[PDB]
Amino acid sequence: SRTGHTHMPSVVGVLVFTQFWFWFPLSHFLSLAYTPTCVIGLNKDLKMPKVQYKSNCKPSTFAYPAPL
Amino acid sequence: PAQLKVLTMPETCRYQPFKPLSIGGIIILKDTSEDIEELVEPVAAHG
Amino acid sequence: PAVDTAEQVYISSLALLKMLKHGRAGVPMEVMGLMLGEFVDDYTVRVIDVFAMPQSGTGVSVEAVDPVFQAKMLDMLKQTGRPEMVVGWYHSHPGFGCWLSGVDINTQQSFEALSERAVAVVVDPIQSVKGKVVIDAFRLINANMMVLGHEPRQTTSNLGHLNKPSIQALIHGLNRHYYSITINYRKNELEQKMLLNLHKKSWMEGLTLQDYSEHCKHNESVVKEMLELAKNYNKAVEEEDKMTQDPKRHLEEHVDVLMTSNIVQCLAAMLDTVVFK
Amino acid sequence: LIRNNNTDLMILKNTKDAVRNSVCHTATVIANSFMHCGTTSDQFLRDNLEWLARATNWAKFTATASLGVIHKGHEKEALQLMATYLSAYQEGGGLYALGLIHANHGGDIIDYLLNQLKNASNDIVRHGGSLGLGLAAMGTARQDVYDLLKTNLYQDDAVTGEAAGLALGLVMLGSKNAQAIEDMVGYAQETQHEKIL
Amino acid sequence: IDINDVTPNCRVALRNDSYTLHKILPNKVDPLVSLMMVEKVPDSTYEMIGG
Amino acid sequence: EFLHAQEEVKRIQSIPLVIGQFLEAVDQNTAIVGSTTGSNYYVRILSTIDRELLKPNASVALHKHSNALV
Ligand SMILES: [Zn+2]
Incomplete structure (x- = not known):
């Protein structure tokens, strides 16, 4: 996880997915290994308020891929 | 995740991070100024 | 309900030794025999033992089955303590690679009609030279499915494949008319030891x-x-x-x-x- | 994710056009599942119906599981959503997809999955429900769930036994339950199905 | 392989029992005529000839 | 594991081999042979057969089924 603790859902999903060689239906287990790369701001009311973050880098190194 | 060591907010707006924008995930942005405090709409879950 | 490409035939060590012995004990004749065993659930053909068949003169065909002999030995082995059905049949193709001819396809079709999960095993004594045991297991495909276009055998797991089909079989219809099956061996520790005893060196030699x-x-x-x-x-x-x-x-x-x-x-x-x- | 759902569809369309085999077909199914995972958007599947209809046998199971993964994290419309989306492979895949939607955080739907797995008639539905229950109860170590999964394992059928064992592992995850270890190891040493192994 | 590479009259290898052209062997040269070619030049020289 | 490999090589280099005539060296570890059976094949040369000593139109011994210039 973001702090350092081993992410049990992630490890379980990765292991079971790797165990697809013997059973394709297990391939979906990897779904558990996805961690949303989101930094979400929340306030006292617990309702996500409109806020603007600033990052100091070019708008090319972390942007979505070209649409092709 | 590499783009977390360098991440902040402009001119320290009404919302100030509780913990620096390096751990990431979810942050309880403390509020100082009182205003309308417009929320973000709950978009429908179909795409 | 379509067979998937994970079915595997577990040929016992005894079965393999008997089959290869009979092949080399009657080469160049097309020797034949039954395969006593037990389908486990749907993806296994556990061939406990094989079944030598008298030389019927008419090569290899349904005419060589000899039903009276088959049934009488079936009952007699059952008395001995070997109660298994007739899972598939083995027959040699001396020298001429491993594949099914027209008569082979006909016999396999009869076996499938009797029970549509049996197998046809092919062993080549001449080309099974030291260090190489060229054996194959086959089952037929259905014309209705082939014309419909649906693949003859489902593929749910990465198993079943991992094998390069011989160009000989490709020419003789490795997929147009039939399809191959993976062959596993149930090598028990005791059988492995008793085999080791063959070339095991005595303390005198040591x-x-x-x-x-x-x-x-x-x-x-x-x-x-x-x-x-x-x-x-x-x-x-x-x-x-x-x-x-x-x-x-x-x-x-x-x-x-x-x-x-x-x-x-x-x-x-x-x-x-x-x-x- | 739904807000930042900036997926790409025409790359998937190109792969779909390039597919010829069932293996590649299910590959595209799973790839679309991954691409839309956590997005709840099933545009590609809801568009290419004939493509889904081409799926046969366990491909249907995999496709329904893909739908579940796409709807990962979407627990408000569960039950009714899966009923609306709708053979034995279809039902098993639906149960497994519901289990995947209700990931490690299970809870309410544990009793649901348990009841359907209990009163599931076909071994394929048993397999799907067992996998879904394993997903839902992963780490919870619920004794009732473990007992039901052990009962579903104590048979002789690869399709049921594989899912039963995997679900037993998921539910007993980390608990180190010595009784569970003894039971599973004994059944492994005694059974006669490599897939159950 | 290419058709423009298998332009006529060139030895080509064929896979067994399938006869699928899969190589461009060197142009045919008959054995017992290939060896009719001096590969090691004799040691004679015009300096060894007089008159 | 490297052992058993020399063994399998020496075993494929067996006794019942068939004699033939090595016609030309198409490329490294491969060449054209003509088996005394009366037909020409494009076969694979085993390793360590002294390519220097493998001159055109020489007498070679081939595997009985693979026809490799053993
Ligand atoms: Zn035959």
Whole structure:
């Protein structure tokens, strides 16, 4: 996880997915290994308020891929 | 995740991070100024 | 309900030995026999044992099944304590690779009609030379499915594949008319030990001494060959250095054989001379 | 994710056009599942119906599981959503997809999955429900769930036994339950199905 | 392989029992005529001839 | 594991081989042979057969089924 603790859902999903060689239906287990790369701001009311973050880098190194 | 060591907010707006924008995930942005405090709409879950 | 490409035939060690023995015990004839075993659930064909069939004269075909013989031995083995159904049939194709001919397809079709999960096993005694056991297992495909276009055999797991189908079988219809099945072997530890007993070396052999006269003669042969190789090695290295291998490799082999043989015999000599007194 | 659902569809369309085999077909199914995972958007599947209809046998199971993964994290419309989306492979895949939607955080739907797995008739539905229950109860170590999964394992059928074992592992995850270890190891040493192994 | 590479009259290898052209062997040269070609020049020289 | 490999090589280099005539060296570890059976094949040369000693139209011995210039 973001702090350092081993992410049990992630490890379980990765292991079971790797165990697809013997059973394709297990391939979906990897779904558990996805961690949303989101930094979400929340306030006292617990309702996500409109806020603007600033990052100091070019708008090319972390942007979505070209649409092709 | 590499783009977390360098991440902040402009001119320290009404919302100030509780913990620096390096751990990431979810942050309880403390509020100082009182205003309308417009929320973000709950978009429908179909795409 | 379509068979997937994970079904596997677990041929017992006894079954394999009997099959190969019969093939080489009747080559060049197309020997035939039944395969007694038990389908487990849907993806296994556990061939416990095989079943030699008398030479029927008419090559290999349904006419060679001899139902009276088949049934009577079935009952008699069941009495002995071997109650298994007739899972598939094996028959050899001496020299001519592994695949099914027209008569083979007809016989396999009859077997499938009797029970549509049996198999047809092909063994080639001539090409199953030392170190290579060229055996194959096959089952037929249905014309209705083939015309419909749906693949003959489902693929739910990465197993079943991992094998390169022989071009011989491709030509003879490895997919147009039938399809191959993976062959696994149920090697029990006890059977593996009893097989090891074949070439297992007795303690006499282990602790004996090689003849000293022959030992000296072999040492001389190898040492003289090593001398010649050393001359060639010098020539090669000198010419290489002046300008700026096989002799070195042969020299290494000869030195290794000399060292191992001499040390082995000397140690055995001491073991014997202070064990037997 | 739904807000930042900036997926790409025409690359998937190109792969779909390039597919010829069932293996590649299910590969595209799973790839679309991954691409839309956590997005709850099933545009590609809801568009290419004939493509889904081409799926046969366990491909249907995999496709329904893909739908579940796409609807990962979407627990408000569960039950009714899966009923609306709708053979034995279809039902098993639906149960497994519901289990995947209700990931490690299970809870309410544990009793649901348990009841359907209990009163599931076909071994394929048993397999799907067992996998879904394993997903839902992963780490919870619920004794009732473990007992039901052990009962579903104590048979002789690869399709049921594989899912039963995997679900037993998921539910007993980390608990180190010595009784569970003994039971599963004994059944492994005694059974006669490599897939159950 | 290419058709423009298998332009006529060139030895080509064929896979067994399938006869699938899969190589461009060197142009045919009959054995017992291949060896009719001086590979090691004799040691004679015009300096060894007088008159 | 490297052992058993020399063994399998020496075993494929068996006794019942068939004699033939090595016609030309198409490329490294491969060549054209003509088996005394009366037909020409494009077969694979084993390793360590002294390519220097493998001159055109020489007498070679081939595997009985693979026809490799053993
Ligand atoms: Zn035959």
